[PDB]
Amino acid sequence: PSIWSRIVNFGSGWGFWVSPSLFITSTHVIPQSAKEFFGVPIKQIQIHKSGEFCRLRFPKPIRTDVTGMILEEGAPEGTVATLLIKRPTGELMPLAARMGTHATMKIQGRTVGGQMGMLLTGSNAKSMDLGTTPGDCGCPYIYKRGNDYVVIGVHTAAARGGNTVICATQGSEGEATLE
Amino acid sequence: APPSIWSRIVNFGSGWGFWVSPSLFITSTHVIPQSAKEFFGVPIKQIQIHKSGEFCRLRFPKPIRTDVTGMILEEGAPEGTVATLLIKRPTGELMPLAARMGTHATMKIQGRTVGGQMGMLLTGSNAKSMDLGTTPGDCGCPYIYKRGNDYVVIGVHTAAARGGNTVICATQGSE
Numbered sequence: 001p002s003i004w005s006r007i008v009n010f011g012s013g014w015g016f017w018v019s020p021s022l023f024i025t026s027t028h029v030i031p032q033s034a035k036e037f038f039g040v041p042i043k044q045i046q047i048h049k050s051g052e053f054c055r056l057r058f059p060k061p062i063r064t065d066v067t068g069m070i071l072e073e074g075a076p077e078g079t080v081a082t083l084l085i086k087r088p089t090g091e092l093m094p095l096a097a098r099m100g101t102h103a104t105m106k107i108q109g110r111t112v113g114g115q116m117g118m119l120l121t122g123s124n125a126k127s128m129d130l131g132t133t134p135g136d137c138g139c140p141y142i143y144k145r146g147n148d149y150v151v152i153g154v155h156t157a158a159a160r161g162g163n164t165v166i167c168a169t170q171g172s173e174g175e176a177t178l179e
Numbered sequence: 180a181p182p183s184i185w186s187r188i189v190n191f192g193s194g195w196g197f198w199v200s201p202s203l204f205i206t207s208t209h210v211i212p213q214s215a216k217e218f219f220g221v222p223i224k225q226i227q228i229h230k231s232g233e234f235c236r237l238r239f240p241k242p243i244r245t246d247v248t249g250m251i252l253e254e255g256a257p258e259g260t261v262a263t264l265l266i267k268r269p270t271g272e273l274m275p276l277a278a279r280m281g282t283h284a285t286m287k288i289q290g291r292t293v294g295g296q297m298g299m300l301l302t303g304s305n306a307k308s309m310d311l312g313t314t315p316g317d318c319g320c321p322y323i324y325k326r327g328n329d330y331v332v333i334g335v336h337t338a339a340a341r342g343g344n345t346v347i348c349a350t351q352g353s354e
Contacts (some may be wrong), residue, residue: 003310042227082303082311087327091180092214096303119279120301127325129180129275143303156334 001065003149007086007139014138019068019150026137026156026168027054038062051113052156062139070150073170074115075099081117083155083165085136087158092123093129095096096120097141102173105157105166112157114166117141125162132158132165141167142156180265180275184330186248186322188267195319197335201242201256207318207337207349219243232294233337234349246286251331254352255296256280256345262298262324264336264346266317276313277301278322278346280333283353286340293338295347300324306339306346313339314348322348 006017014030029051035143037045037056046057077100085093097117104113125131132155139155156168183310194210202333204218208230218226229240237242256262258281266274278298285294304311321332334348 019340080303089273090271091275093275093277095277096301096306120279121261129263130261130277 003094004086005082006063009083009088010138012137013080013135014124015058015136016140016154017035018071018115020063020066020076021058021059022071023056023062024071024140024151024154025054026055026154027052028156029138030054031037034064050171052166053114053153053170056129062138062179063123067116069150070145071170072152073173074167075141075143075150075152077101078088080120081141081152083132083139083141084137085132085155089136093128095130095132097154098150099167102169103166105159107157113172114153114156114169117165117167119165122163123161131162134158180263180323181328183247185265185267185273187244188265188320191319193318194316197319197321197332198244198247199252199332201244201247202239204237204239204243204346205252205321205335206235206237207335208233209337210319231351232349233347234295234334236351251329252351253331253333254354255283255348255350256322256333257284257325260324260331262322262333262348263302264300264313264320264322266313266320266336278348280322280348283350285321286338286347288338288340288347291338292347293347295337295349296334298346298348300344300346302344304344305342306344307341312344317337320340 015025030147048055083095097119100116102113123132153167153169157166192210192212196206225240229236260280264276280298319338334350337349338347
């Protein structure tokens with residue numbers, strides 16, 4: 001099956017099926033108060049919210065047609081990852097983005113954390129087919145390792161110019177404390 | 180890309196074609212049905228067929244697509260322009276692929292000599308990819324970009340290089 005089949009509507013945004021039981025999305029697109037997800041009661045779902053990242057594990061497999069997939073935390077700096085954007089009009093937009101350091105961004109009255117990236121379309125990211133839109137939150141960032149696909153996070157925010165984007169990852173890594 | 184631009188893209192032979200005006204139809208010479216005798220119900224004798232490299236222009240005697248207007252056609256695009264390859268798939272999906280346009284050149288692809296304006300896909304993946312790139316049978320899809328407030332077509336897809344993000348856009352002229 002196609003990889004785009006793993007990207008489904010969820011709340012006000014999108015979500016990605018990493019496996020028949022694992023489903024990742026952005027936190028600010030989840031329904032604020034719901035009773036069930038994909039026919040499963042909320043109490044029977046293992047839900048982990050780490051910053052803007054959100055993961056859902058189900059007690060029984062849901063999407064039995066997809067296979068397991070690698071979910072790393074970010075990508076090496078300089079990697080040209082791909083954001084897979086789905087629009088409600090039916091279009092599929094693979095947008096390339098060079099990934100940089102992890103960072104926080106001041107947006108609205110708050111701050112949003114994740115790995116920073118810059119789209120390769122440059123200033124042309126103001127166009128609708130060359131950049132992101134707030135409705136694309138939850139769409140996945142992936143890149144190819146060998147002959148396999150690796151998802152590193154989901155779209156959560158973009159800067160005022162639209163060129164710089166933020167990828168929500170499983171969590172930030174602090175430096176160790178030895179002995 | 181409004182729904183009108185997408186409606187101008189139609190199936191044609193081995194690939195796709197683009198209605199520039201109600202009477203003009205551009206496509207790639209690679210996807211032409213060679214053993215045909217009628218295009219859109221019109222015999223071949225009545226249609227002006229002009230081939231510039233892999234680019235193919237068809238001028239019909241009577242208007243065929245009366246629902247479309249006339250849009251601008253450019254003999255290539257300025258270097259560095261970020262255009263959009265509008266791919267339609269038989270699954271019904273729409274796939275706009277961003278591509279940075281470069282210089283005109285000629286390559287040898289699968290034993291065929293193909294000339295045109297070269298571009299590089301900004302999709303992160305190689306130009307030959309089912310889920311993220313182009314496939315055989317995507318030829319004829321147009322390259323579109325917005326100059327000021329006019330959507331213009333610079334050419335049609337005719338070839339994708341193996342092992343890289345390079346694509347060839349057949350244009351009507353070198354300038």
